[PDB]
C-alpha cells in the first residue's frame, strides 16, 4: 500500500488532479493495452494511444474483432474515435461514438522515431526489473 | 451563587482567555523535529560525544537541595589552572569553562579537578592533519577505540 508521504490518497485530490490534467499528462492517462502479439514482439504492456493506430473495442456496445483505425483522440473529452464505431442521429448523418481508450486494445501501432524510442525504453525498464527479480 | 457547601473558587477567566490559548497538537511533531535535529547534530560531530561537553560537579544552592549534587554550567578558572590546561584551549578540547563561578571550598575544588584530570586520560585526540600525528594520540587506539559517546559525558552521581 501507499507509503510515500508526499503522494496523496485523497479521493477529491485525485479526482481534481485527473479532471484538470494538462494535455501532456492527459496523454498518459489515455494509455491503452497492447495485444498479445504486440506484447510478445515488444516487452511493453500498455502504450499511450496515438492518432492513426488500429484498435478493437473490447467492452461496451461495440465489442468485437473489427480492427478499426483510431481517427481522433479527444483529450478534452477523455475519449477516442474509431472508423466504424459510429451512430446515426435523427437527421440520418453519422457521428462517432467516443469510447475510453482503456476499453480498447491496440493491434498495430503507428511507429515513428519517437514511438520506437518510447517502445524501447519501456522494454529496457521491464528487463531491468526482471533481472533484479531473478 | 453558592449552593450549599464547597470551595470558594476564584477562576482566573475574566481576561478574554480564549484568544491566548496554547494547544499542544504539535507536541508529537515537535518531539520528532527535536529528535532528528539531535540525530543530525550527533552525526555532524562524528567522534565527539554527541551530547555537549563535560560539565562539573555542582552542589545545589539552597538548604532544600544542598544535599544533592548536579552538573553546573562549566568548570571554573581555578580548577582549570590546577589541572594545567589553558582556558582557551579547554573549550576546543570539549570542556566548557565557566569563568564567573568561584570556588569557596577545597573539597568542591578537588572534586572538579579530579574530574578534569581523569577526563583528560579518557580523551582521545585526533591529529588535525591525519598524515602527521604530531602530539594528538597513537594510531593504534585511534582507529578501534574512537566511537561516539551517547548520553552526557560521565554523569554526576549522588
Amino acid at each position: 500500500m501507499k507509503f510515500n508521504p508526499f503522494v496523496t490518497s485523497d479521493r477529491s485530490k485525485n479526482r481534481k488532479r485527473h479532471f484538470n490534467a494538462p494535455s501532456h499528462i492527459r496523454r498518459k492517462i489515455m494509455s491503452s493495452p497492447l495485444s498479445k502479439e504486440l506484447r510478445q514482439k515488444y516487452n511493453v504492456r500498455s502504450m499511450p494511444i496515438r492518432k492513426d493506430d488500429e484498435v478493437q473495442v473490447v467492452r461496451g456496445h461495440y465489442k468485437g474483432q473489427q480492427i478499426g483505425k483510431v481517427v481522433q483522440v479527444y483529450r478534452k473529452k477523455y475519449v477516442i474515435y474509431i472508423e466504424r464505431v459510429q451512430r446515426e442521429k435523427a437527421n440520418g448523418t453519422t457521428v462517432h461514438v467516443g469510447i475510453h481508450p482503456s476499453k480498447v486494445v491496440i493491434t498495430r501501432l503507428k511507429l515513428d522515431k519517437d514511438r520506437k524510442k518510447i517502445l524501447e525504453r519501456k522494454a529496457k525498464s521491464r528487463q531491468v526489473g526482471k533481472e533484479k527479480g531473478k | 451563587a453558592p449552593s450549599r457547601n464547597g470551595m470558594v473558587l476564584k477562576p482566573h477567566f475574566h481576561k478574554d482567555w480564549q484568544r491566548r490559548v496554547a494547544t499542544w497538537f504539535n507536541q508529537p511533531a515537535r518531539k520528532i523535529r527535536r529528535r532528528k535535529a539531535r540525530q543530525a547534530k550527533a552525526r555532524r560531530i562524528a567522534p565527539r560525544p554527541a551530547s555537549g561537553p563535560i560539565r562539573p560537579i555542582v552542589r545545589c544552592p539552597t538548604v532544600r537541595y544542598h544535599t544533592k549534587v548536579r552538573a553546573g554550567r562549566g568548570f571554573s578558572l581555578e580548577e582549570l589552572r590546577v589541572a594545567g590546561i589553558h582556558k582557551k584551549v579547554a573549550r576546543t578540547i570539549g570542556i566548557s569553562v565557566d569563568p564567573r563561578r568561584r570556588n569557596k571550598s577545597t573539597e568542591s575544588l578537588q572534586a572538579n579537578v579530579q574530574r578534569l584530570k581523569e577526563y583528560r586520560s579518557k580523551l582521545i585526540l585526533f591529529p588535525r592533519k591525519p598524515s602527521a600525528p604530531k602530539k594528538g594520540d597513537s594510531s593504534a587506539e585511534e582507529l578501534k577505540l574512537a566511537t561516539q559517546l551517547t548520553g552526557p559525558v560521565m554523569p554526576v552521581r549522588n
Binding site: 500500500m1 490518497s9 485523497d10 479521493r11 | 490559548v21 494547544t23 497538537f25
Partner: protein, 263 residues
Amino acid sequence: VSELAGHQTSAESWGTGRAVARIPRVRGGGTHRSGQGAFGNMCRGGRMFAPTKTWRRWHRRVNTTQKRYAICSALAASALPALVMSKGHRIEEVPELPLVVEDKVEGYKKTKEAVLLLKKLKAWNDIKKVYASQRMRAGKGKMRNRRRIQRRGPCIIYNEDNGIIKAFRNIPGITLLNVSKLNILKLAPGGHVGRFCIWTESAFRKLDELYGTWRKAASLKSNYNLPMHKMINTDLSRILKSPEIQRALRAPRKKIHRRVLKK
C-alpha cells in the same frame, strides 16, 4: 469550525416597534441578504449554538498498570478457542491454539511463501473470510477517505524483523505486532478480547521475561508483576458439586405452591 463563521455580518437588532422578531438583521437594502436574520443558531447562515473548539480534550491518559493489565487480559483470551471463535476467526483446522512457528518465518521475503505458510498452518480460512468481508462502507465515511472496509485477520507477533513485515502486509487483515511493543488497539480490535494470533518461537519465549511469571518479576519492565486473581478456581460446577459444599446445604424446596382458589 471557523471562529468567524456566522459573525462577519455587522447586523443590528432592528428594534421592536416594527412588526418583526427581535433577532439581529443584516443592514443594507439592495440584496436578498438585507433584512434577514443573523448571528443566531436559529438563523440561516448564522452561528451555530456553542461552536465546536479545537481544545476539546481529545486525548485520555490511562494508567500504565491498567494498560498492561488489559494487554495481559487480551493475551490470555487469545489462548482460549471459545473466545477466539467467538470473535469469528475460523480456527477449526488449526492445531495447538496458541500457535507458534519457528523463526524461519521471521526471515521470509516474498508474499508467496507467506501465503503458503498460512495455508499449511491452516490459518488461510480466516484470510478467505477477510476477502469475503471486503465491501463498501455506509455513509459519509466514503466521502472522507474511509471508502472500503473489511474484517480483521490474524495477528503475526514476531521478535526480530528479517523481512517478515514485507512478506506479509499485502494479505488483507494481517497485522504484525513486534512482541517487544504490543498494542491493545490491535490485540482487541473492537474492544473485544480474543483475536487470532500467530507467534514465532523467539516471540513466544520472550513473552515470559516481558511480563514475568507470578513467582518472578518481569525483567524487561523493571517494576511489573502479573496481576493476581481474586478467584483461583473459576468453575462453579465443580465448586457447587463438591462434597464439602453439598454436605453443608439444606434440601431444596422444589415443589411449587400456586395460589389456591378460596372456595
